[PDB]
Swiss-Prot record, chains B, G, H:
GO cellular component, one term: chloroplast thylakoid membrane
The protein, known as: B-phycoerythrin beta chain
InterPro entries named among the record's database cross-references: Globin-like_sf, Phycobilisome_asu/bsu, Phycobilisome_asu/bsu_sf
Organism of derivation: Porphyridium purpureum
Pfam families in the record: Phycobilisome
Binding site for phycourobilin: C50, C61
Cell compartments where the protein resides: Plastid, Chloroplast thylakoid membrane
PANTHER family documented for this protein: C-PHYCOCYANIN BETA SUBUNIT, PHYCOBILISOME 32.1 KDA LINKER POLYPEPTIDE, PHYCOCYANIN-ASSOCIATED, ROD 2-RELATED
Length: 33, 177, 164, 207, 380, 161, 177, 177
């Protein structure tokens, strides 16, 4: 049985929005959906 | 980094003394010829582009061995790095003259510069000469004694700021030595 | 120390630029305002042995519980060290009036204060009580001039806002 | 016993240490003079030879408190690089003692500046050559112009200190003496009259 | 509990900067966080790009002939598609990063360089170096870079928009890691082409061996000597610039040292530590003369205590003062100022100053006593 | 000893020169500040004992040097040190009136460090007491005279260190 | 360097004037042909840096084992220190030419250098090859037969002067042996 | 890193010489047997998987103290790291034989390897033996004299490339020593 960590895309849905960064732009498109 | 005002504050903080009227004689005289300090810094930053190509070419027309094959200024890349070096030192010296204190010079430019050149194989003799020609240009531009550029100034004496920037340049030279 | 000088030449050093006309223009205000902000400096420096005295007992008059056993000012040497702290803070305000910025305050009184005052059970409200008592007792033509009083009160309330 | 710092004295109020650590209140002078201390140090040989033959020995032998920044023999050997050579080569000619004197006199400072005296301080003074020299030691690095002191403080006779530096300090107002050359005279009397503009040329009336 | 969380943890929702960064060396020098704002002038995009080129290449000149490589991948950031972390991922996988830091390097040097570039830290222990070596040897350089960026430690510290910076954490697990961090970044006037020796060994400065020191320090737990941490360092580029009672900056080592001065200094320090260890026990026991009488005098002073103004007429004359917390007990303005001269007045503290400075003078002399044979001496 | 006038005259005489415009510049500079100097010297003569008392109280009065084992523990040593501080204040006043620190070199600093080292007097505490005296003196005489007096106070401290 | 020539002329020396001076020995050397010796040491100090660089690159392009790992010219420190050593030897032999006498060449660098290089494990024959390369470059610069480099001199023969540095470089190469 | 073509370019750049017709006889002969060089590299990279397990197992039946408890190859992790190191050295040697120059070998593999194996406690005696068995396999595979699995080649002589790879392997061995 191999040792497989959670990938980064599996962890990018738990993030906290920060408006001062570019990460505001992904919570643009998360919101009009 | 510090300036001329905070320099006396760390001196008074070493003894828990308030800055009294004895200490402010040196600083209210720093305010009186502050316009001469701005007029002196403006003369250097105006001709700073000529000063590096003046000094590095003077350093060449003295030690041809730098443009010799295998020499330290032999490649276009190495000549560009030497011209880039000169400008950084001229930038930090003009910071120190504007601040009235040499503190920003010897923790952001000269701290660790000794090993930087030693480890690179940069020859220190020509490094001294490139700084001293820039020092000679600085005293000529502050006292308005350049050969072919004169700048408009209000009349008065300026040898104190010239001696201050001359005191910064041999600090640079003793650091790279 | 953050001042008018050390701000504009680190902004120039981070960009790799020579001192431009904005850098020279910023120091021109350091010529005008230094007539007012230095006039409060010797005024606080010469009469600093009446301000610490008048702030220290006002701190204990607001909070008489500090002299109880088990509290911060229970014995004499603790009150002696308490007056020394108000002397330290007024010395840092005297320094900040001389540099022209909040440099010495942010280096020597502000950074790390919120850990030592919680670890050693020093109540910050009793610290800001003395500074506020110094703040409202500024007779604007009698203590100093008008602009020197403005420059003094603006450094007192900065310490008040930083301690709370 | 106590006070890790005991004291001198005798009689009641004593501690067990004689007055002055040896009962000598005013002690004799054990240090030698400037040229003496240099000559026994074994490293300032060229400096002492130049001081003697130059005539500056009389200046540094005076009782006045001096701070000398004598360069080691390494410093004089390090002049064989091109840049400093081009500035000081004509000081080898036997008729150029007058400029050797000013170069040497630039190394002598009136007043006794100890190394601990200069920590985190920037001082400007005039040396015996009459030229301003800046002495600043920041972060335990002492400098005299472009000197970079290497051996801090050797005490001398009349409160004069010696700092050993690793390079020679050229004075600021120093123009190198030019090499000797043949004196030239104009060959043609008419070739020089052709060189001078006449009034009608200053007017713009002539070519 | 004076420190609540570390900086390896994600930032709390109550604090603008991390709690560790407010009272470390972070607030002092230029090693701070440069955040890209959400809409940027074409002026202030270059403020981010200059910090990136200062950090990722780790102090490199980079002529604009060497910038026309990266004019494609900077343009996706200037548009606003690339984040800052994807920009440093694209810059690490470019060829100019490769030819400078991979293409003449031993593997230890390359691993310790991208620890310093892509993160703000030194190699921590040996076990985290070996896992990255085995990550490269089976998957290549491209997956090796993603092993650094795409894990937990990048996004909890930098996020996706702060540029990397040399981290002054304050909390170091393996301790030495602070000394390795200070010896990896060599102050403001150093680079990796110079510290790696890739120019002296190179031919016309190009094609240099990117060699490395301190790989004996990674394998055996043998920590970094003090001279590479105190002389050339970010500690003095990010210094507090204040008055230290022991000055921590080393003096340059003197030429022409002798063994006689070392012998007398080594006797001096041995006298001083013996004096300190006996002056310790007497302090806080027999420190005061009016200490036995402190309990006695309190009951004599407790009489005649009155509230309002004007008392203690002492015969016919009216005037009196009292009424003051510090004054009710006879203390003056000089009573709290005696703590401000203790460095030069406390009998115990004098020994502790002169112990440390005799140690600091001692430590440089045996660095100068490492050279024997063609070494001329003087007579002081 | 030589004051500002004596120093200018000496600089002119050592070159066989007559007093030219620069000498006149320096001489006018001294003559303009002479009256302030006299005012400060009078005020300092008025309050010497209180200045020394306040400096000692703020600098070393309650430290460990006044306790058993400290330099000035006994009454002899206390009196000797207050006499030393009186010397320093009086000579700083002389130097301020003269506008030249040569009297400090000739009458005070010559062989002082060696005497203190032979006696065992702590130099740092002495410099600290002189610094505290500088505060009180500048306080009492105002800003300009305080700057003038602090020049010679710092001269003494540098010559002692 | 500076004290190589006597320069007797002094005014009010009070030790020198009205006292005996090196008139018999110092003066004759200076009169006899010191201009040739001065063009000589100028032709060394204007070419010195290219000389040590070309020398160590000629040694390395003859023997690559020093630049191999395990070699003495590997590591950041060795390249820097070996360049420094070769230039120091050049500076001392330039002084020994300028003095016309090889005493300080013994006393300040050649005294106990071989045992130092044995204690450091420095290979000797490579340094002998280096100083022979410097000897060839020195006599090439002294005959003005540099194929790459030109200075103008007053016309004449400097053959006697050229041998001088060959004897000095052979003294170095034998003392290291 | 360099190759056989650029090796003569840094040799000519040391004297500012153009690469003339004398220099190109060594390089046009490098082109003539370039097909033999590709045919020699292809024979090594074909059996490179057998070569490591051949050499490391030979080093084990040399010395059973490596698989002894506490030995350097005692753990599966340590045996995998030794098989990993064998392959890295065989990879860089095949790089150097393909390039015709040993430059990529001793700044990417051998620079800093000796003090690494000293700091790890890796025994150097067995490190020499694991490299020498791989060298013996290399000369057998280039000259087509392997006990098992011969390879098809055009007829001709190949001892020059075999001597070149034998010259690379003792460079590796002298580096790790
Ligand atoms: C933290 C939680 C977490 C997970 C649940 C997994 C799931 C997961 N799988 C893939 C990626 C994939 N996942 C699958 C899986 C499948 N395709 C099929 O037809 C089957 C139904 C199923 C296997 C049973 C395949 C085939 C890919 C590869 C797609 C590709 O390579 O193009 C990816 C994208 C990253 C990548 O490309 O590898 C993720 C996030 N990984 C995680 O990190
Ligand atoms: C923060 C402060 C700061 C500086 C002061 C400079 C100085 C500096 N220059 C170089 C690098 C260099 N510096 C020089 C300079 C010179 N060589 C000479 O012979 C002349 C004496 C002198 C020019 C006048 C050269 C030629 C190189 C290139 C060396 C090489 O490419 O091998 C390096 C190493 C990085 C690099 O390779 O570019 C540094 C740190 N840069 C900085 O960031
Ligand atoms: C052998 C090679 C060689 C050179 C390349 C030049 C370069 C050069 N110029 C100056 C000396 C100077 N150099 C400058 C620089 C400049 N002057 C200007 O008017 C411009 C603004 C700017 C360059 C465009 C200045 C201002 C001085 C002072 C004197 C003057 O020009 O008025 C010096 C130092 C003193 C001197 O030697 O004159 C040198 C080495 N001279 C040389 O001997
Ligand atoms: C924002 C940009 C900015 C500046 C550039 C300076 C500009 C400046 N310089 C001076 C004014 C002056 N500048 C000089 C300086 C000199 N004169 C000489 O003959 C020497 C060559 C040189 C010495 C270095 C002198 C002597 C004065 C007049 C004295 C003084 O005002 O202090 C003044 C006051 C006079 C006036 O113009 O009203 C000003 C505003 N100030 C600024 O706010
Ligand atoms: C360095 C700056 C500086 C100041 C801020 C003041 C500060 C100040 N003034 C007073 C002391 C005083 N302060 C005032 C002033 C006032 N009383 C009022 O009711 C009004 C609000 C205000 C005038 C408008 C008066 C009238 C006294 C004397 C009586 C009293 O304490 O109220 C005291 C108490 C100790 C003392 O008597 O000196 C202090 C600390 N003085 C200074 O030197
Ligand atoms: C440079 C800036 C600077 C400061 C601001 C102070 C801050 C400070 N105060 C104390 C220490 C103390 N500080 C106080 C002060 C007070 N307690 C109270 O209830 C009141 C709020 C206040 C008096 C008005 C007391 C009573 C102690 C003793 C606490 C203890 O010893 O545990 C300490 C611990 C070491 C010491 O005893 O000095 C420090 C660092 N010190 C400094 O060096
Ligand atoms: C992983 C293990 C680990 C530790 C053990 C600590 C220890 C530690 N302390 C400091 C840093 C410091 N440490 C001290 C501590 C002291 N000084 C004294 O006089 C006292 C004897 C002692 C407190 C009791 C002080 C005063 C500083 C600050 C120095 C400064 O700011 O210049 C630093 C450098 C980083 C920094 O500047 O903050 C480190 C690594 N931190 C760690 O991460
Ligand atoms: C493969 C490696 C390799 C090298 C790096 C060069 C190195 C080199 N240069 C010279 C030889 C020389 N080197 C110089 C030195 C210089 N010429 C100048 O014009 C500059 C000012 C200065 C620095 C470049 C001189 C003047 C000569 C003699 C003339 C000549 O042969 O070119 C010699 C011959 C010395 C001898 O043994 O007689 C060698 C080996 N040659 C090589 O075979
Ligand atoms: C007054 C005259 C004088 C000198 C000539 C040098 C001589 C000298 N060189 C070295 C030291 C050294 N010298 C060399 C030089 C070389 N190694 C080689 O393989 C080449 C043959 C040669 C360069 C061309 C090297 C590589 C070291 C460092 C050895 C080491 O790393 O320990 C040392 C030991 C101190 C040190 O390590 O720096 C000394 C005393 N020093 C002096 O004071
Ligand atoms: C302080 C710096 C300084 C110098 C550099 C020399 C420069 C110099 N050289 C000579 C003069 C000369 N220099 C030489 C030397 C040579 N001629 C050659 O063709 C050979 C290459 C080389 C042999 C080494 C000769 C042969 C003469 C003419 C005879 C003589 O005066 O010695 C002269 C006198 C005539 C003239 O002005 O030209 C001078 C001033 N003298 C100095 O004072
Ligand atoms: C870029 C070039 C490069 C190399 C050459 C290798 C070599 C190498 N091997 C090891 C690490 C090792 N190397 C060996 C190898 C051996 N021990 C023996 O007894 C045998 C003689 C030999 C196998 C034939 C072993 C056993 C370890 C593991 C040591 C341990 O785990 O404690 C390490 C330290 C990292 C680690 O722990 O894995 C390195 C750098 N790796 C590289 O990246
Ligand atoms: C004591 C333990 C011990 C061993 C484990 C073997 C391992 C071994 N084989 C060879 C010698 C060799 N080893 C190989 C390697 C291989 N041969 C092949 O045909 C395959 C392609 C590949 C492994 C699958 C080759 C090609 C030779 C050369 C001779 C030949 O096999 O034709 C050598 C060196 C010379 C020799 O000793 O023979 C050793 C130590 N021999 C031993 O003495
Ligand atoms: C005009 C210039 C001048 C000065 C200054 C001077 C000083 C001087 N100070 C002395 C002693 C002294 N000086 C001090 C002073 C101090 N103790 C401390 O702790 C303090 C730091 C310091 C006071 C600030 C003490 C305590 C002694 C007595 C030493 C003893 O009795 O052993 C003595 C010994 C003479 C005696 O008292 O019998 C001289 C000669 N002489 C001069 O000619």
């Amino acid at each position: 049985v191999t040792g497989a960590v959670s990938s980064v895309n599996m962890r990018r849905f738990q993030r906290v929005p920060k408006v001062s960064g570019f990460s505001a732009k992904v919570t643009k498109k998360n919101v009009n959906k | 980094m510090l300036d001329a005002f905070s320099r006396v504050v760390v001196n008074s903080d070493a003894k828990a003394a308030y800055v009294g009227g004895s200490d402010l004689q040196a600083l209210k005289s720093f305010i009186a010829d502050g316009n001469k300090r701005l007029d002196a810094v403006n003369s250097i930053v105006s001709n700073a582009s000529c000063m590096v190509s003046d000094a590095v070419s003077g350093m060449i027309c003295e030690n041809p061995g730098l443009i010799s094959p295998g020499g330290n200024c032999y490649t276009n890349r190495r000549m560009a790095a030497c011209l880039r070096d000169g400008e950084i030192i001229l930038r930090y010296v003009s910071y120190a003259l504007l601040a009235g204190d040499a503190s920003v010079l010897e923790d952001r430019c000269l701290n660790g510069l000794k090993e930087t050149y030693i480890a690179l194989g940069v020859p220190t003799n020509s490094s001294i000469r490139a700084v001293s020609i820039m020092k000679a240009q600085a005293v000529a531009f502050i006292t308005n004694t350049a050969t072919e550029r004169k700048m408009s100034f209000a009349a008065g004496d300026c040898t104190s700021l010239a001696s201050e920037v001359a005191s910064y340049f041999d600090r640079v030279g003793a650091a790279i030595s | 120390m953050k001042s008018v000088i050390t701000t504009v030449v680190s902004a120039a050093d981070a960009a790799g630029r020579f001192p431009s006309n904005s850098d020279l223009e910023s120091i021109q205000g350091n010529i005008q305002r230094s007539a007012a902000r230095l006039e409060a400096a010797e005024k606080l420096a010469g009469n600093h042995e009446a301000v610490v005295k008048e702030a220290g007992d006002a701190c204990f008059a607001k909070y008489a519980y500090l002299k109880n056993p088990g509290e911060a000012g229970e014995n004499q040497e603790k009150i002696n060290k308490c007056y020394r702290d108000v002397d330290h803070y007024m010395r840092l305000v005297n320094y900040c009036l001389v540099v022209g910025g909040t440099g010495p305050l942010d280096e020597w009184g502000i950074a790390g204060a919120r850990e030592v005052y919680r670890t050693l059970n020093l109540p910050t409200s009793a610290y800001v009580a003395s500074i506020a008592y110094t703040r409202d007792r500024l007779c604007v033509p009698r203590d100093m001039s008008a602009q020197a009083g403005v420059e003094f009160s603006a450094y007192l309330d900065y310490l008040i806002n930083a301690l709370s | 016993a106590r006070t890790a710092y005991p004291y001198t004295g005798s009689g009641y109020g004593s501690a067990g240490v004689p007055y002055g650590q040896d009962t000598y209140g005013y002690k004799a002078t054990t240090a030698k003079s400037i040229t003496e201390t240099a000559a026994q140090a074994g490293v300032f040989n060229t400096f002492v030879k130049l001081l003697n033959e130059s005539g500056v020995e009389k200046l540094v032998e005076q009782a006045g408190p001096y701070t000398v920044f004598a360069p080691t023999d390494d410093a004089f050997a390090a002049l064989l690089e091109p840049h400093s050579f081009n500035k000081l080569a004509t000081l080898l000619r036997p008729e150029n003692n007058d400029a050797l004197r000013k170069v040497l006199m630039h190394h002598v400072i009136p007043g006794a500046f100890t190394s601990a005296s200069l920590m985190d301080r920037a001082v400007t003074v005039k040396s015996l050559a009459g030229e301003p020299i800046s002495i600043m030691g920041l972060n335990k690095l002492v400098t005299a112009g472009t000197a970079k002191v290497v051996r801090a403080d050797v005490p001398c006779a009349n409160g004069c200190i010696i700092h050993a530096v690793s390079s020679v300090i050229i004075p600021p107002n120093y123009v190198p003496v030019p090499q000797p050359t043949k004196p030239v005279f104009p060959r043609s009397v008419i070739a020089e009259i052709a060189k001078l503009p006449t009034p009608r040329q200053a007017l713009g009336l002539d070519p | 509990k004076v420190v609540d969380r570390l900086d390896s943890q994600p930032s709390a929702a109550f604090e603008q900067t991390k709690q560790v960064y407010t009272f470390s060396r972070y607030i002092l020098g230029p090693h701070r966080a440069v955040v890209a704002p959400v809409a940027m002038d074409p002026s202030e995009k270059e403020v981010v790009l200059r910090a990136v080129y200062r950090q990722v290449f780790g102090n490199a000149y980079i002529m604009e002939e060497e910038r026309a490589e990266l004019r494609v991948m900077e343009s996706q950031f200037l548009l606003g598609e690339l984040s800052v972390k994807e920009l440093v991922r694209a810059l690490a996988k470019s060829s100019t990063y490769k030819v400078r830091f991979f293409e003449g390097a031993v593997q230890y040097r390359f691993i310790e360089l991208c620890f310093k570039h892509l993160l703000g830290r030194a190699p921590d222990n040996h076990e985290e170096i070996a896992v990255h070596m085995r990550k490269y040897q089976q998957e290549g350089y491209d997956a090796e870079i993603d092993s650094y960026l795409d894990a937990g430690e990048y996004d909890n510290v930098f996020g996706d928009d702060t540029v990397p910076f040399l981290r002054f954490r304050g909390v170091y697990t393996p301790c030495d890691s602070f000394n390795r961090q200070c010896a990896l970044q060599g102050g403001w006037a150093n680079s990796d082409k110079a510290m790696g020796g890739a120019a002296l060994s190179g031919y016309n400065g190009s094609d240099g061996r990117q060699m490395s020191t301190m790989i004996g320090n990674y394998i055996s737990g043998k920590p970094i000597p003090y001279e590479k941490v105190a002389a050339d360092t970010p500690l003095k580029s990010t210094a507090p610039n204040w008055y230290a009672r022991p000055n921590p900056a080393l003096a340059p080592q003197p030429a022409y040292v002798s063994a006689k001065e070392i012998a007398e200094l080594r006797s001096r320090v041995s006298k001083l530590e013996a004096a300190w260890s006996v002056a310790v026990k007497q302090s806080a026991a027999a420190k005061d003369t009016v200490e036995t009488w402190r309990a006695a005098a309190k009951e004599m002073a407790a009489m005649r205590g009155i509230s309002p103004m004007g008392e203690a007429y002492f015969g016919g004359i009216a005037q009196k003062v009292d009424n003051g917390a510090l004054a009710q007990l006879g203390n003056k303005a000089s009573s709290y100022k005696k703590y401000l001269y203790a460095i030069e007045t406390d009998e115990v503290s004098r020994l502790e100053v002169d112990l440390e400075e005799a140690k600091g003078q001692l430590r440089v002399l045996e660095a100068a006593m490492a050279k024997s044979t063609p070494m001329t001496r003087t007579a002081e | 000893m030589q004051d500002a006038i004596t120093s200018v005259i000496n600089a002119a005489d050592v070159q066989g020169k007559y007093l030219d415009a620069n000498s006149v510049e320096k001489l006018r500079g001294y003559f303009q500040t002479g009256e302030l100097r006299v005012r400060a010297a009078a005020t300092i003569a008025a309050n010497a004992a209180t200045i020394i008392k306040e400096a000692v109280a703020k600098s070393l009065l309650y430290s460990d040097i006044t306790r058993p084992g400290g330099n000035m523990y006994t009454t002899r040593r206390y009196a000797a040190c207050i006499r030393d501080l009186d010397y320093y204040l009086r000579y700083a006043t002389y130097g301020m009136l003269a506008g030249d620190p040569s009297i400090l070199d000739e009458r005070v600093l010559n062989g002082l460090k060696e005497t203190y080292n032979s006696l065992g007097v702590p130099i740092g505490a002495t410099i600290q007491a002189i610094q505290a005296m500088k505060e009180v003196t500048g306080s009492l005489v105002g800003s300009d005279a305080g700057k003038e007096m602090g020049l010679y106070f710092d001269y003494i401290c540098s010559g002692l260190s």
